[PDB]
Amino acid sequence: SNGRDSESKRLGAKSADGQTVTGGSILYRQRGTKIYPGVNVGIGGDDTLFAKVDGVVRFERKGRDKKQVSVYPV
């Protein structure tokens, strides 16, 4: 019989492009590297992308078919 489902995990983008964030702010929750960590951005043990410094978030292209998040301080 059916009738089961796991709790939803609230994945996806947590900070906006062009938004100023403090260091440590989570930018993107994901399974796998759907988006890659760019400049001043790290990737956690469960693929969460977080800011390493204070700066403005930019979602960028990584080559042809990949994306990327970076944080640029002012």
25 counts as binding RNA under rule CB under 7 A:
yes
Q: Report the DSSP pairing between strands 49-51 and 26-29.
A: antiparallel
Residue 19 binds: one of Mg ion, RNA, none (C-beta under 5 to 8 A by kind): RNA
Q: Report the DSSP pairing between strands 66-72 and 36-37.
A: parallel
16 counts as binding RNA under rule CB under 7 A:
yes
Distance of CA 29 to the CA centre of its chain: 6
**Residue of 15, 29, 13 whose CA lies nearest to 71:** 15
| Range 34-63, binding RNA (CB under 7 A) | 34-35, 42, 44-48, 50, 52-53, 56, 58-59, 61, 63
Contact residues: RNA, CB under 7 A: 1-26, 28-35, 42, 44-48, 50, 52-53, 56, 58-59, 61, 63-67
